[PDB]
C-alpha cells in the first residue's frame, strides 16, 4: 500500500523533465517576486518514504567462537541454549552462590543464600497468583 | 557532427519509452462479454444448462 | 605519415605528423631561454598556423595527441602564461586546439572532464582579442575536410551555452562556479557572443536558439531583430527569413511559462513588421491576442496612403478573417473617419460579405435532405431539431418551415427548441427573421422565448457596420421582466457578437449578472453569456462575474444543476488569458469551502496553460484521492461531493486540450491515450466517475485536433453504446465531422447501427438521432473546427458553447442549448476589384514533408485540384497556391488558412 | 537543429507522461475487486470452463436456442447462454462453445478468422494516382465508374439513370490492373478491402460460402468502400481431378458471389473491383451487362505510353548516364510495361556481371535481345515476301 | 504467460484439456520431411563439367542477392523474383542447382515432382501456397520446386487447371517476399524442360524472373565434360581424348557420360583396366549407332 503511492509521486516528476529545463529558469525568480511555499532553500521537493516492516538479523562472522570469550550479563529466567550453560558462572557479588559446583548444563539449580533477611523480589509461580 | 548528434541521445530515450509502454499495457488481460443486464442472464443460465435439450 | 625530413615541402608536412620541429623543440626551448627570442616567436606564429591547416586533413587521433603533447604542458609548466605577458596571450591561437585534441580526439575520461573547465577560461580571455572568434570561424566555414573538426568546434560553442544556462538554475552565477570558471556577463564575453552569433546564423542554426533561450530576456531576442532584418532580402529571400523567426516562436514557445511566452512572441511580431510581408505580421498579432498589436498593422496600410489604392481593401480583408469579430470592431470606424468610400469598406470588414460568398459555394454543393420522417411523441421533437442540424449555415429550406403543421405539434420545452432550430437554417444570414416573427406575436410564451434564441443564431453573420445588430432587437426583451424571455435574449446576444466586446453589447451585460439571491435555475444563462462574450481577447476577469458566483453559493445549494453551470462559466470567461489568471486562483481560494475547491481545479487549467506539465500531474493526483484514502483504512454532503468529482474530470480534459495545440510541436497522437488510461481506471474504480469521463472524451478530441480520426472514435463508440448516457455519441460526432464524407463516412453507419438496432426508450433514442445529422453537411458545404483555422495553434470563440455541454446528465432543457453550434469556416476564393467568386486552382497535399516547420509550410509540388473547392480538413490541410501559373501573385499568403485568397494579375 | 528541438519537446512529454499514467493504473484497477466486478468475472468463469471450442452461429431459433456448426463433422442444437444473448449475437459470427456440453458460453473471437485478417485493411492504398502514371484513358473509365458515385451520387440522380455498379478489369496481362485497383481507391478517399479469391476456395463443405459472406458484411460497416476481389478468374471454372473431383465447391462459391452484387442492396457504395484475365476464364454464367457496368479493356501500351512507363523505371535505376530513353523506344515495338520492367533489371544484371558501375546504351540492346528472343517471326516475311 | 506467447509460436498441448507444456521452436512441415532424407548436395562447380557460360551467369543470379541484396540494387535495379531453368534433358540442370547451392551455404530442399502428392495428413492443394511460409521459417533456404512439365498447351489457355491455380496463388504470394522481411535471401529456383509445356502462371518472359536457356554442349565443352570422368576412370594410354570429342557432339552431358560407361564394358571383357584408343573407338561407335541409323533415312532415300 505504501509502495503504490511512493512510486506514484516520483515517476511524475521524472516525465516532466524535458519541458522543465527552460521552465526552471523562469521558476526561480517568480518565487522571489511572488511567494514561497514554506522554505527558502532552493526549490526542494518531496521524495516520499517507502514501507519496510522487517528488521532482519545478519549472520555471524566467527564460527570458531559463537560465544566469544568476552563477558556478557545473562539474566536469570531467560532462554539458555546449551552452549551458554558451559560458560554460566554464578557470581559472588550477589548473595546467591551454588550449593555445590554448577553442572554446566541448564536446569533447576538450588542456591545458598547468604542473606535471605534482606528484601529481594521474588518471582511468583502460577500457583502463587491464584492464592 | 554536433547540431544533430547532441540532441539525438535525447531522442533515443524517447524511443526507449515507446518500447516500454506496449509491454507495460499487455500485462493486464480481463473480460467481460456483454453488459450489466445480461449478468442477470447467467443466474438463470446455470439452470437451463443442467436441464437437457 | 612516416618521417622523411626536409627534402621538399610536402615531406615537411609528413615530418611534423609524428614530431613537429617548428612547433615543439625550437619554440619550447626558445620560450624557456631568451626573451629577445619573443621577436622570433611572433614571426613564427604565422608559420605554425599554416602547419595546422595542412594537417587538418589528417584525422588519426595518435598523430595530433602525441605531436602537440608537450605544448599542452607548456601552458602552465614553462611559459606559465605570463613570462612575457602579451606574447603568450597572442600565441594562445595554436595552443587552444592542442587542449581540444585531448577533450575530443582522444578520450581519456580524467582529462576530458578536467580540460573542459580550462577551455572555458581561455576562450573568454582570448575573445577580448576577438581572435577567438576567428579561431571558431576557420572551422565553422572549414578549409579542410575531416571527421575531426566537425566534432571539435562544438566543444568551443558549448562553453558559452554551459555557463549561461547555469546562471538561472544556480543563483550565484559568474566565475564563482568552477564548472566553467568564466564570468557570465561583462564587456569581454558579451562582444564574443554577438560576433559568434553572426557566423553561426549564416552557416548553421545552432547557438542562435540556445542563446535567446539562455538569457531568458526579450533583450536577447531584440538583438536578433537587427541582424536578421538586414538579411531579409539580399542575403536570402523573405520566405527563408520567416521560417527562422516563427520556428523560434513555435520552438522556443517551449519551456516558456506565461510572462516570458508573451514577451518572446512580441519580438517575433516586430521582426515580421520590419520585413516586407505584413501578411506574416497579422498572423502573429492575432496570436498574442492583444488589441494593441492588431491596430498597428491595420493602421500601417490605412493611414499613410491618402488614396484608396490597394491599401484600404487589404486592411479590410486582414481584419475580416477572424470570425471572433474581435478584429472587426476595432478596425471599423477608421474607414468612416478617412472617408474615401464608406459603403464598400464597412461591408468588407464585416461578416456581411462572408454571407454572399457562401451562396456561390452552395450552388455547387446543392441540397440533399435525409431528415427523419418520424412524428408523434418524443420522435416528433427529435425530427424537427434534426432538420436544422442538417441545414446548418446558410441554406434555403423555407417551404418546409412554412408548413406549420409539424411546428405546432412540438410541446413544452420542445416548442422553444423547435423555433431555435428554425433559426439555424438561416444561420449566418440576414433573411430568415420573418419565420420567427409569426410565432413570436401569438400563442403561449414558450414560442416567444424560442424565437429569441433563433434571432441569436441568425445574427451571427450580420452584426457589424450598424446593419441590423443583435443588440437592436434583443434590448427590448431584456427590459421585459419575464425570466424566460430575458434569459433567452441575453443568450442570443452573446452568441451573435461572439468575441466582440462593443460598448453597447458589453455595457448592457454589465449591471446584470448580479442577482442569484432569487432561486432561478435558468439564470445560468446570466453568467454563461457574459463568459462567451469575453473569450477571443484579453480578459479583465470581470468583477461582475466573480461576485455573483460567490453570492449564489451563499443563497442556495438545492439546485445542483445551477451551481455546476456557474462553475464552468468562470473557467470559460478566463480563456484568452493566462498571466492574469494566476492571480485569480488565489482570490477564489481565499474563501475556502469544499464546494469552492470544485471551482479552483477548473481555473488552474487556464492559468497554467502553455506550460501545463505541473498541471497534468495535478489533475491525476486529484482523481486518485477518493479511492486512495479508503485504501489506507482497509489494510449537504451529497451536493458538495458531486460538484467536486465532476469538476476535476472536466478540468483534466480542458488542460490537456489547450497544451497539446500550443508549446512543445508533435505529441497530438498520444493525448487521446492520456485520456484512455484515465477512462479505463475510472470505469473499474468509481462507478459514478465513469459517467463523466465518457462525455468529456469526445470534446477532448475535437478541441485537441487529433491527426487520427478513423480508428479511435469508432472503437471507443462500440464500448460506449452499452454504457449509460447516449450523450457520449453527440460529443464524438463533433470531432468526426472533419471534411465531410471522409471521416464521417464510417461514422453514419457506426452511430446508426446502435440507434436503429436498439429501441428501449425514446429518451435514449433522441440523443443518438441528433448526433448523426450533425456529423454530415451535404457535400462538404462547410466544416467545423474548434480551431480558428487562421492559426492551427488557435482556438475559436463560437465553438465554446459546444465545449460547455458535456458536463451534465442529458436533459430536455439542455436540448435547447444544443441547437446553437456555430463555428463556421469560409471557403477561399480569389478576389478581384469586382469581387470574383471563383478560385482558379490550388494544390492540396495531405501531409507536409517539411522538417524545418512543424506546422509545415506547404510543399510546392502538391497534387492539383480544380476551382471552387472547400478548404479541406485533415489530410488536405497544407494548401499551396497555384495562381503563379497564371502571372498572378498572391497578396495574401495562404497555407491552409481560413483566409480568402486575393491575387493581383499583371 | 531547432526543428528537431521542438519535436523533441512534444514527443517526449506525450509518450513519457502516458507511460507513468499506464504504469500506475494497472495497480489502481487490481487493488479494488470488491462488489460488482468480482461477481461478474466469477460467474463468467463458472459458466465457461476450459477448453473452449470454436463454433459458428448458423441461425437463432426464437425460444433462446440456436443451431451451430462445429469444426468437427457433427452439427448440434444448442442453448444460448451467458452474457452473450441473441440480440448481442448475429448470425454468421464465431462463437465460444463449451467442449463437454455444447452451449454458447461467450465470445472473444467476435468473427475473427485468418481470412478476415487478410481481407481487412481500412487504411488508404499504397499507390496513389500515376505511381500509377499513364493507361490514363483506362483510369478514365475506372474513375468514372468507381470514384464518381461515391463522391457525389447526386450526379446520377440529376442525370436520371441508375448509378454504376462494379467494374470488370479484363484484357491484357502486364498492364498492371492488379496495381491500378490500388491507384484509384486512394484518390476517391474511401476504405479499401483487398482479398485474393484463391483463399475463398476450400476443400471443406459450407466453408467456401461463409468466407464469401464475411466480405460484404465488413464492407457495409466501413462504407463507403471499394472492395477488391483480386483474381475472380482464379475461382474460374477449373477442376482438380474428375475421378475424385474438387469441382463442386467452385460453383457454390461463384454463385454466392453473383448473388450479393445486386442482392447486398442496390447501391454504388458497395463497389466491387473484379480483376480477370479474360471473361472466358470465368464461369460463363454471368449477371446481366449493367449489373457489373462497364467492362474495362486493357490492351498493349502504344509508343507514347511505354515512354511514360519506361521513364518511371529508369529514374529509380542508378548510374545510367549513358542511356538515352528515346533510342530504347525506337528499336523496340509495342510491348507491355511488364517487359520494360524486366529489361531494366536484366540490364543491371549484365553490368554487375562485367564489373563496371556504369550502365550503357549498348548494354540495354543485349537486354532487348534476351527478352525478344523467342518471339521471333519469320512468317512476317513469309506473307510480305 | 501471455507475455512469453507470440503469434506464430508452435506449442505443445495435452489430450485431456489441451493445456500447454513447452514452447517449440521446431516446425514439422511436409517440406521438412522431404529435406530430411536427402540432406545437402555433395556437388561443387567442378562436379558438373562444361556449361561455361551458364555457371558464370547464375553466380550473379543466385549468390549475389543473398550476400549483398543492396549491391545488386545499387548498381542495377530491383531483385530477382525468380530463376527458371530450361533446356534439353540430360544437360544437368538439376545437377547445376545442387552445385551452386553448396557454395551459397543455404538449405537446398528440394522438392521432387508434383505437390499434390501429400494426402495422408491432408491434401496437397494448399501446401503449394503455404510453401511461402515454410521456406521463410527455415531461412536462409533455397527451394528447388521441380516440376519437369507435361501439362502442355491445353491449360495455358484460360488459366485452367486446379494445379495451376494453387501454383498461381503461391506466385501471388511470391512478390511479397521482397517486403515481408526485406529483400531476397531465399531463391525460388524452378526447373522445367520447356516454355511450351509450361503452366500458365509461369508462362510470359520475366513473369517469374530470369529465363535462361541451357545450350547443348560445344566440342570444347564435351571435351571438358570428358576430362573429369577420365581421372575417375583409369587414364587413357596415348591421350586419345580428342578423338571422342571430334567424332560426335551431343545434345546432352548425358551422352558424354554414356561413353565413359560404355568404354568400361569393353576394357572389362578384354581384362585390361586401363582405357585405350581401341576401347575408345569401340565406345564412340556404340554411342553413335543410336544416331547414325535415324540420320541415314534422311541422308539417303530422300526425295
Ligand atoms: N501504370 C504504371 N506505371 C508504372 N508501372 C506500371 C504501371 N502499370 C504497370 N506497371 C508495371 O508492370 C507491373 C505489372 O503489372 P501488374 O502486376 O498489375 O499486372 P496484371 O495486368 O494484373 O496481370 P495478370 O493477368 O497476371 O493478373 C507492375 O508491377 C508495375 O511494375
Ligand atoms: N555436365 C555434366 N557432367 C557430368 N555428368 C553430366 C553432366 N550433365 C549431365 N550429366 C549426366 O547426365 C545425367 C542426367 O542429367 P540430369 O538428370 O541432371 O538432367 P536435366 O537437364 O536437368 O533434365 P530434365 O529435363 O529431365 O529435368 C546426370 O545424372 C549425369 O550422370
Ligand atoms: Mg494480376
Ligand atoms: Mg533435371
Q: Give the DSSP per-residue string, E225-293.
A: HHHHHHHHSPPPSS--HHHHHHH---SSHHHHHHHHHHHHHHHHHHT--S--HHHHHHHHHHHHHHHHT
φ/ψ of residue E164, rounded to 5: -70, -30
Which atom of ligand 2 approaches the CA of E87 most closely?
A: 21
Closest alpha carbon to C323 in C495, C192, C76: C495
Tell me, using a 6 A CB cutoff, whether residue E89 lines ligand 2. yes
Residue C382, classified by CB atoms within 10 Å of its CB into exposed (0-12), middle (13-18) or buried (19+), is buried
Q: Give CA–CA dist C469/C496, Å, rounded.
A: 9
Question: Which of C150, C165, C251 to substitute to test the interface with B, most B CBs within 10 Å?
Answer: C150
- Helix, strand and coil content of chain A, in percent to the nearest 5, comes to 30, 5, 65
Q: Given phi > 0 = left and psi -120 to 50 = alpha, else beta, which region is C181?
A: left
Handedness of CA D270, D273, D278, D281 (dihedral sign): negative
Closest alpha carbon to C115 in C95, C93, C88: C95
Tell me, using a 6 A CB cutoff, whether residue D332 lines ligand 1. no
Q: How many CB atoms lie within 10 A of CB D84?
A: 23
Instruction: Provide the grid cell at E237.
Output: 594410354
Residues 6 or more apart in contact with residue C438 via CB below 8 angstroms: none
Say whether D9 and A12 touch across the interface (CB within 8 A): no
Q: Does B have 3 or more CB contacts under 8 Å with E?
A: yes
Pairing of strands D225-230, E83-86: unpaired
- CA E91 to ligand 4 center in whole angstroms: 8
Q: Given phi > 0 = left and psi -120 to 50 = alpha, else beta, which region is C13?
A: alpha
Q: Given phi > 0 = left and psi -120 to 50 = alpha, else beta, which region is D175?
A: alpha
Q: Do residues B34 and C718 touch, judged by C-beta distance below 8 A?
A: no
The beta-carbon neighbor of A23 closest among C255, C620, C624 is: C255
Residue appearing with cell numbers 473547392: C869
Over its C-alpha atoms, chain D yields an Rg (Å, rounded) of 28
Whether the CB of D27 is below 8 Å from some CB of chain A: the reply is yes
SS3 state of residue D125:
coil
Q: Give CA–CA dist D130/D305, Å, rounded.
A: 12
DSSP-H helix ranges across C204-324: 208-215, 218-230, 238-252, 258-274, 279-288, 291-302, 311-320
CA distances in angstroms from A59 to A71, A87, C694, listed in the order given: 20, 22, 58
Closest alpha carbon to A34 in C257, C655, C537, C267: C257
Q: Give CA–CA dist C819/C813, Å, rounded.
A: 11
Whether the CB of D204 is below 8 Å from some CB of chain B: the reply is no
Q: Do residues E217 and E50 touch, judged by C-beta distance below 8 A?
A: yes
Q: Give CA–CA dist C102/C106, Å, rounded.
A: 5
**Paired strand residues for D67:** D59, D77
Residue appearing with cell numbers 581540444: C100
Tell me, using a 6 A CB cutoff, whether residue D103 lines ligand 1. no
- Would you give the DSSP letter of residue D322? B
SS3 state of residue C867:
coil
CA distances in angstroms from C362 to A81, C322, C829, C834, D189, listed in the order given: 101, 22, 13, 20, 22
**Paired strand residues for E155:** none
CA distances in angstroms from C699 to C3, C295, C713, listed in the order given: 76, 34, 11
- Would you give the DSSP letter of residue C716? H
Closest alpha carbon to C288 in C499, C535, C500, C537: C537
End-to-end CA distance of chain A: 50
Q: Please give the distance of CA D190 from its chain centroid, rounded to a whole number.
A: 14
Q: Do residues C570 and C553 touch, judged by C-beta distance below 8 A?
A: no
Instruction: Give, in degrees to the nearest 5, the angle at Cα D138 between D132 and D141.
Output: 120
Question: Which of B3, B22, B24, B34 to substitute to test the interface with C, most C CBs within 10 Å?
Answer: B3
- Would you give the DSSP letter of residue D295? E
- CA C512 to ligand 3 center in whole angstroms: 74
Which atom of ligand 2 approaches the CA of E254 most closely?
A: 12
Q: Given phi > 0 = left and psi -120 to 50 = alpha, else beta, which region is C783?
A: beta
Which atom of ligand 2 approaches the CA of E50 most closely?
A: 1
Residues 6 or more apart in contact with residue A50 via CB below 8 angstroms: A2, A3, A6
SS3 state of residue C183:
coil
- Tell me how close the Cα of E20 comes to any Cα of chain B, in angstroms: 18
Q: Give CA–CA dist D189/D197, Å, rounded.
A: 24
Segment 3-22 of chain D within 8 Å of chain A by CB:
8-9, 12-13, 16-17, 19-20
The beta-carbon neighbor of C617 closest among A12, A23, A26 is: A12
**Paired strand residues for D77:** D67
Tell me, using a 6 A CB cutoff, whether residue D133 lines ligand 1. yes
Whether the CB of A91 is below 8 Å from some CB of chain D: the reply is no
Instruction: Provide the grid cell at C203.
Output: 552557416
Residue identifier of the C-alpha nearest atom 16 of ligand 1: D176
CA distances in angstroms from C269 to C221, C245, C837, listed in the order given: 11, 9, 32
Whether the CB of C635 is below 8 Å from some CB of chain D: the reply is no
Amino acid at each position: 500500500e505504501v509502495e503504490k503511492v511512493a512510486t506514484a509521486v516520483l515517476s511524475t516528476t521524472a516525465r516532466a523533465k524535458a519541458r522543465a529545463k527552460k521552465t526552471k529558469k523562469e521558476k526561480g525568480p517568480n518565487e522571489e517576486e511572488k511567494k514561497k511555499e514554506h522554505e527558502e532553500k532552493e526549490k526542494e521537493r518531496e521524495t516520499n518514504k517507502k514501507g519496510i516492516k522487517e528488521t532482519k538479523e545478519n549472520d555471524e562472522e566467527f564460527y570458531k567462537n559463537k560465544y566469544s570469550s568476552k563477558p556478557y550479563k545473562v539474566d536469570n529466567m531467560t532462554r539458555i541454549l546449551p552452549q551458554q550453560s558451559r560458560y554460566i558462572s554464578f557470581i559472588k557479588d550477589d548473595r546467591f552462590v551454588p550449593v555445590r559446583k554448577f553442572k554446566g548444563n541448564n536446569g533447576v539449580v538450588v542456591l545458598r543464600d547468604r542473606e535471605p533477611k534482606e528484601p529481594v523480589a521474588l518471582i511468583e509461580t502460577v500457583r502463587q497468583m491464584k492464592d | 557532427a554536433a547540431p544533430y548528434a547532441a540532441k539525438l541521445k535525447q531522442t533515443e530515450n524517447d524511443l526507449k519509452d515507446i518500447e516500454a509502454r506496449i509491454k507495460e499495457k499487455a500485462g493486464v488481460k480481463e473480460s467481460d462479454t456483454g453488459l450489466a443486464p445480461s449478468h442477470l442472464w447467467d443466474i438463470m443460465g446455470d439452470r437451463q444448462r443442467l436441464g437437457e435439450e | 605519415m612516416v618521417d622523411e625530413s626536409d627534402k621538399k615541402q610536402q615531406t615537411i608536412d609528413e615530418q611534423s605528423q609524428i614530431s613537429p620541429e617548428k612547433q615543439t623543440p625550437n619554440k619550447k626551448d626558445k620560450k624557456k631561454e631568451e626573451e629577445e627570442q619573443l621577436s622570433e616567436e611572433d614571426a613564427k606564429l604565422k608559420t605554425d598556423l599554416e602547419l595546422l591547416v595542412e594537417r587538418l586533413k589528417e584525422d588519426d587521433s595518435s598523430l595530433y595527441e602525441a605531436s602537440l603533447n608537450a605544448l599542452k604542458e607548456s601552458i602552465k609548466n614553462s611559459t606559465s602564461s605570463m613570462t612575457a605577458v602579451p606574447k603568450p596571450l597572442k600565441f594562445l591561437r595554436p595552443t587552444y586546439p592542442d587542449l581540444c585534441s585531448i577533450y575530443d580526439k582522444w578520450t581519456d575520461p580524467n582529462l576530458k572532464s578536467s580540460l573542459a573547465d580550462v577551455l572555458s577560461i581561455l576562450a573568454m580571455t582570448y575573445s577580448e582579442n576577438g581572435k577567438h572568434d576567428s579561431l571558431r570561424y576557420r572551422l565553422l566555414s572549414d578549409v579542410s575536410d575531416f571527421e575531426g573538426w566537425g566534432h571539435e568546434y562544438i566543444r568551443h560553442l558549448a562553453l558559452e551555452i554551459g555557463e549561461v544556462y547555469n546562471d538561472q538554475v544556480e543563483k550565484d552565477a559568474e566565475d564563482e562556479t568552477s564548472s566553467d570558471g568564466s564570468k557570465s556577463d561583462g564587456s569581454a564575453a558579451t562582444s564574443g557572443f554577438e560576433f559568434s552569433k553572426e557566423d553561426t546564423l549564416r552557416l548553421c542554426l545552432d547557438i542562435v536558439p540556445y542563446f535567446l533561450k539562455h538569457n531568458g530576456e526579450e533583450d536577447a531576442v531584440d538583438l536578433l531583430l537587427e541582424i536578421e532584418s538586414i538579411d531579409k532580402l539580399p542575403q536570402f529571400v523573405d520566405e527563408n527569413t520567416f521560417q527562422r523567426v516563427c520556428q523560434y516562436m513555435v520552438a522556443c514557445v517551449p519551456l516558456l511559462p506565461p510572462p516570458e511566452d508573451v514577451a518572446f512572441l512580441k519580438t517575433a511580431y516586430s521582426i515580421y513588421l520590419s520585413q516586407n510581408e505584413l501578411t506574416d505580421a497579422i498572423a502573429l498579432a492575432v496570436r498574442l491576442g492583444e488589441e494593441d498589436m492588431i491596430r498597428s498593422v491595420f493602421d500601417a496600410t490605412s493611414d499613410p496612403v491618402m488614396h484608396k489604392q490597394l491599401a484600404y481593401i487589404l486592411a479590410a480583408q486582414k481584419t475580416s478573417f477572424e470570425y471572433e469579430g474581435v478584429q472587426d470592431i476595432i478596425g471599423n470606424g477608421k474607414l468612416s473617419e478617412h472617408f474615401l468610400y464608406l459603403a464598400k469598406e464597412l461591408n468588407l470588414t464585416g461578416p456581411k460579405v462572408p454571407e454572399d460568398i457562401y451562396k456561390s459555394h452552395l450552388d455547387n454543393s446543392k441540397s440533399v435532405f435525409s431528415s427523419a420522417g418520424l412524428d408523434s411523441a418524443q420522435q416528433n421533437l427529435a425530427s424537427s431539431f434534426v432538420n436544422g442540424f442538417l441545414n446548418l449555415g446558410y441554406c434555403n429550406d423555407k417551404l418546409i418551415v412554412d408548413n406549420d403543421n409539424w411546428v405546432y405539434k412540438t410541446k413544452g420545452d420542445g416548442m422553444t427548441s423547435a423555433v431555435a432550430s428554425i433559426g439555424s437554417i438561416y444561420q449566418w444570414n440576414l433573411d430568415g427573421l420573418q419565420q420567427l416573427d409569426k410565432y413570436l406575436y401569438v400563442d403561449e410564451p414558450e414560442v416567444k422565448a424560442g424565437a429569441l434564441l433563433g434571432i441569436g443564431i441568425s445574427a451571427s453573420g450580420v452584426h457589424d457596420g450598424e446593419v441590423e445588430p443583435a443588440l437592436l432587437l434583443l434590448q427590448d426583451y431584456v427590459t421585459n421582466p419575464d425570466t424566460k424571455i430575458s434569459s433567452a435574449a441575453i443568450l442570443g446576444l452573446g452568441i451573435a457578437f461572439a468575441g466582440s466586446k462593443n460598448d453597447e453589447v458589453l455595457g448592457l451585460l454589465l449591471p446584470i449578472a448580479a442577482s442569484t439571491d432569487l432561486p432561478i435555475e435558468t439564470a445560468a444563462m446570466a453568467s454563461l453569456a457574459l463568459a462567451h462574450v469575453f473569450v477571443g481577447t484579453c480578459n479583465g476577469d470581470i468583477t461582475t462575474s466573480i461576485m455573483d458566483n460567490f453570492l449564489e453559493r451563499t443563497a442556495i445549494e438545492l439546485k445542483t444543476d445551477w451551481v455546476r453551470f456557474l462553475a464552468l462559466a468562470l473557467g470559460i470567461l478566463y480563456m484568452g488569458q493566462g498571466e492574469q489568471v494566476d492571480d485569480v486562483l488565489e482570490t477564489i481560494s481565499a474563501i475556502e469551502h469544499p464546494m469552492t475547491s470544485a471551482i479552483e481545479v477548473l481555473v488552474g487549467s487556464c492559468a497554467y496553460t502553455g506550460t501545463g506539465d505541473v498541471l497534468l500531474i495535478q489533475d491525476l493526483l486529484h482523481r486518485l484521492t477518493p479511492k486512495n484514502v479508503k485504501g489506507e483504512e482497509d489494510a449537504e454532503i451529497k451536493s458538495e461531493e458531486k460538484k467536486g468529482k465532476s469538476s476535476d474530470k472536466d478540468a483534466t480534459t480542458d488542460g490537456k486540450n489547450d497544451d497539446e495545440e500550443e508549446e512543445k510541436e508533435a505529441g497530438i497522437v498520444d493525448e487521446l491515450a492520456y485520456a484512455v488510461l484515465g477512462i479505463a481506471l475510472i470505469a473499474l474504480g468509481e462507478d459514478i466517475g465513469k459517467e463523466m469521463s465518457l462525455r468529456h472524451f469526445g470534446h477532448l478530441m475535437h478541441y485537441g485536433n487529433e491527426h487520427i480520426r478513423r480508428m479511435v472514435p469508432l472503437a471507443m463508440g462500440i464500448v460506449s453504446v452499452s454504457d449509460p448516457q447516449m450523450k457520449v455519441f453527440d460529443t464524438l460526432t463533433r470531432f468526426s465531422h472533419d471534411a465531410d464524407l471522409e471521416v464521417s463516412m464510417n461514422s453514419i453507419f457506426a452511430m446508426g447501427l446502435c440507434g436503429a438496432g436498439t429501441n428501449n426508450a425514446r429518451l435514449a433514442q433522441l440523443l443518438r438521432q441528433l448526433a448523426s445529422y450533425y456529423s454530415r453537411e451535404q457535400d462538404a458545404l462547410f466544416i467545423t473546427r474548434l480551431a480558428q483555422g487562421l492559426l492551427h495553434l488557435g482556438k475559436g470563440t463560437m465553438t465554446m458553447d459546444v465545449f460547455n455541454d458535456a458536463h451534465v446528465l442529458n436533459k430536455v432543457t439542455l436540448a435547447s442549448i444544443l441547437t446553437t453550434a456555430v463555428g463556421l469556416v469560409s471557403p477561399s476564393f480569389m478576389l478581384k476589384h469586382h469581387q470574383l467568386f471563383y478560385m482558379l486552382n490550388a494544390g492540396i497535399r495531405p501531409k507536409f514533408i517539411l522538417a524545418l516547420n512543424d506546422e509545415g509550410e506547404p510543399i510546392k509540388v502538391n497534387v492539383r485540384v480544380g476551382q471552387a473547392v472547400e478548404t479541406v480538413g485533415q489530410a488536405g490541410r497544407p494548401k499551396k497556391i497555384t495562381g503563379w501559373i497564371t502571372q498572378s501573385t498572391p497578396v495574401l499568403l495562404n497555407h491552409g488558412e481560413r483566409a480568402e485568397l486575393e491575387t493581383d494579375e499583371y | 537543429t531547432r526543428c528537431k528541438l521542438k519535436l523533441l519537446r512534444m514527443e517526449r512529454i506525450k509518450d513519457h507522461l502516458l507511460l507513468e499514467e499506464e504504469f500506475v493504473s494497472n495497480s489502481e484497477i487490481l487493488k479494488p475487486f470488491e462488489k460488482k466486478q468480482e461477481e461478474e468475472k466469477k460467474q463468467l468463469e463458472e459458466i465457461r470452463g476450459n477448453p473452449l471450442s470454436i463454433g459458428t452461429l448458423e441461425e437463432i431459433i426464437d425460444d433462446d436456442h440456436a443451431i451451430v456448426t462445429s469444426p468437427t463433422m457433427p452439427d448440434y442444437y444448442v442453448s444460448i447462454l451467458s452474457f452473450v444473448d441473441k440480440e448481442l449475437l448475429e448470425p454468421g459470427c464465431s462463437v465460444l462453445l463449451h467442449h463437454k456440453t455444447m452451449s454458447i458460453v461467450g465470445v472473444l473471437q467476435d468473427d475473427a478468422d485468418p481470412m478476415v485478417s487478410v481481407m481487412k485493411m481500412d487504411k488508404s492504398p499504397t499507390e496513389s494516382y500515376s505511381d500509377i502514371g499513364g493507361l490514363e484513358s483506362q483510369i478514365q473509365e475506372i474513375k468514372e465508374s468507381v470514384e464518381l458515385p461515391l463522391t457525389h451520387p447526386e450526379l446520377y440522380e440529376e442525370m436520371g439513370i441508375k448509378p454504376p455498379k462494379g467494374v470488370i478489369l479484363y484484357g491484357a496481362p502486364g498492364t498492371g490492373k492488379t496495381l491500378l485497383a490500388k491507384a484509384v481507391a486512394n484518390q476517391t478517399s474511401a476504405t479499401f478491402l483487398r482479398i485474393v479469391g484463391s483463399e475463398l476456395i476450400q476443400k471443406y463443405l459450407g466453408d467456401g460460402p461463409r468466407l464469401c459472406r464475411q466480405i460484404f458484411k465488413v464492407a457495409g460497416e466501413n462504407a463507403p468502400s471499394i472492395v477488391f476481389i483480386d483474381e475472380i478468374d482464379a475461382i474460374g471454372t477449373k477442376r482438380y481431378d474428375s475421378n475424385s473431383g474438387g469441382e463442386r465447391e467452385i460453383q457454390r462459391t461463384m454463385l454466392e458471389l453473383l448473388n450479393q452484387l445486386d442482392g447486398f442492396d442496390d447501391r454504388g457504395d458497395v463497389k466491387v473491383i473484379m480483376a480477370t484475365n479474360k471473361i472466358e476464364t470465368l464461369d460463363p454464367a454471368l449477371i446481366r451487362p449493367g449489373r457489373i457496368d462497364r467492362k474495362i479493356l486493357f490492351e498493349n501500351p502504344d509508343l507514347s505510353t511505354k515512354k511514360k512507363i519506361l521513364g518511371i523505371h529508369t529514374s529509380k535505376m542508378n548510374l545510367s548516364e549513358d542511356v538515352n530513353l528515346e533510342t530504347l523506344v525506337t528499336t523496340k515495338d509495342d510491348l507491355s510495361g511488364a517487359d520494360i520492367q524486366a529489361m531494366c533489371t536484366e540490364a543491371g544484371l549484365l553490368a554487375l556481371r562485367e564489373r563496371r558501375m556504369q550502365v550503357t546504351a549498348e548494354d540495354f540492346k543485349q537486354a532487348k535481345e534476351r527478352v525478344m528472343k523467342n518471339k521471333v517471326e519469320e512468317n512476317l516475311e513469309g506473307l510480305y515476301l | 504467460n501471455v507475455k512469453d506467447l507470440k503469434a506464430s509460436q508452435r506449442v505443445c498441448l495435452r489430450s485431456d484439456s489441451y493445456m500447454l507444456h513447452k514452447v517449440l521452436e521446431n516446425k514439422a512441415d511436409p517440406l521438412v520431411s522431404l529435406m530430411m532424407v536427402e540432406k545437402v548436395p555433395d556437388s561443387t562447380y567442378d562436379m558438373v563439367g562444361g556449361l561455361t557460360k551458364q555457371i558464370k551467369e547464375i553466380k550473379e543470379v543466385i549468390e549475389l542477392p543473398v550476400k549483398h541484396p543492396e549491391l545488386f540494387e545499387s548498381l542495377g535495379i530491383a531483385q530477382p523474383k525468380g530463376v527458371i531453368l530450361y533446356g534439353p534433358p540430360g544437360t544437368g540442370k538439376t545437377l547445376l542447382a545442387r552445385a551452386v547451392a553448396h557454395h551459397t551455404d543455404c538449405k537446398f530442399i528440394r522438392v521432387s515432382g508434383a505437390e499434390l502428392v501429400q494426402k495422408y495428413i491432408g491434401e496437397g492443394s494448399r501446401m503449394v501456397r503455404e510453401l511461402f511460409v515454410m521456406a521463410r521459417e527455415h531461412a536462409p533456404s533455397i527451394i528447388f520446386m521441380d516440376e519437369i512439365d507435361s501439362i502442355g498447351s491445353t491449360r495455358v489457355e484460360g488459366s485452367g487447371g486446379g494445379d495451376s491455380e494453387v501454383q498461381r496463388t503461391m506466385l501471388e504470394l511470391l512478390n511479397q517476399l521482397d517486403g515481408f522481411e526485406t529483400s531476397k535471401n531465399i531463391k525460388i529456383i524452378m526447373a522445367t524442360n520447356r516454355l511450351d509445356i509450361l503452366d500458365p502462371a509461369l508462362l510470359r518472359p520475366g513473369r517469374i524472373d530470369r529465363k535462361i536457356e541451357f545450350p547443348p554442349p560445344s566440342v570444347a565443352a564435351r571435351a571438358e565434360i570428358l576430362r573429369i570422368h577420365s581421372r575417375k576412370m583409369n587414364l587413357t594410354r596415348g591421350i586419345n581424348l580428342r578423338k571422342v570429342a571430334e567424332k560426335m557432339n551431343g545434345c546432352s552431358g548425358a551422352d558424354v557420360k554414356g561413353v565413359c560407361t560404355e568404354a568400361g564394358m569393353y576394357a572389362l571383357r578384354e581384362r585390361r583396366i586401363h582405357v585405350t584408343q581401341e576401347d575408345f573407338e569401340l565406345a564412340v561407335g556404340k554411342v553413335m549407332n543410336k544416331n547414325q541409323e535415324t540420320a541415314i533415312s534422311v541422308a539417303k532415300l530422300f526425295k
